[PDB]
């Protein structure tokens, strides 16, 4: 896809009731939400996914964005601390696949 902005998630744990807020470069807030919820074992109403804008998607951020989102959601849940991951280009190109 070579979207010029690679995949990126910030997950912010809220400390109450399993509440978490994610800032994600994704075309799919819903699946991001669902996948993080299930991975944590909390209902969807606890998870908020926010997308301001992406520096390219082209279909590459329709689903494969969630492999970063989930890892990061977990780190945030575990540590009680905000966690962030933006993929390097080599990482993004290897992990996320293509046409």
């Amino acid at each position: 896809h070579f979207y010029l902005e690679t995949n990126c998630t910030i997950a912010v744990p809220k400390g109450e009731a399993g509440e978490m807020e994610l800032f994600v470069s994704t075309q799919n807030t819903m699946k991001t939400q669902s996948f993080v919820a299930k991975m944590l074992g909390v209902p969807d109403n606890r998870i908020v996914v926010r997308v301001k804008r992406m520096g390219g998607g082209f279909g590459g951020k329709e689903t494969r964005s969630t492999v970063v989102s989930t890892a990061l959601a977990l780190a945030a849940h575990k540590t009680g601390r905000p966690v962030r991951c933006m993929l390097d280009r080599d990482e993004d190109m290897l992990i996320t696949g293509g046409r």
């Binding site: 807030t29 908020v48 996914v49 926010r50 997308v51 301001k52 520096g55």
Partner: protein
């Protein structure tokens, strides 16, 4: 928004629907806690689907403003709106399309 100008288009749509300038309409972000259960931005479809949603949301507002528009057909948008507020009429609406 991923560079395809979706928000621009939806602002264009809402402006025509409400008959106000685009200057008075803003879109800040996309969020699971404002619109739930959204399909991905994909299949070239997102302006068609969201455009209709936006349209319908605007139609609901217009329907609520109608009586204040009849009473003051020329007096500006700001006046209708403040009138609806002080008459305790909702100025929030969802819209949806399949």
């Amino acid at each position: 928004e991923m560079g395809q100008g979706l928000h621009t288009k939806m602002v264009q749509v809402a402006s025509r629907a409400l008959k106000i300038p685009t200057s008075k309409i803003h879109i800040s972000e996309t969020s699971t806690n404002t619109v739930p259960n959204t399909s991905p931005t994909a299949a070239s479809a997102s302006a068609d689907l969201n455009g209709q949603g936006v349209y319908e949301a605007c139609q609901t507002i217009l329907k609520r403003l109608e009586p204040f528009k009849k009473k003051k057909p020329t007096g500006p948008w700001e006046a209708w709106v403040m009138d609806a507020y002080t008459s305790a009429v909702s100025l929030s609406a969802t819209g949806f399309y399949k």
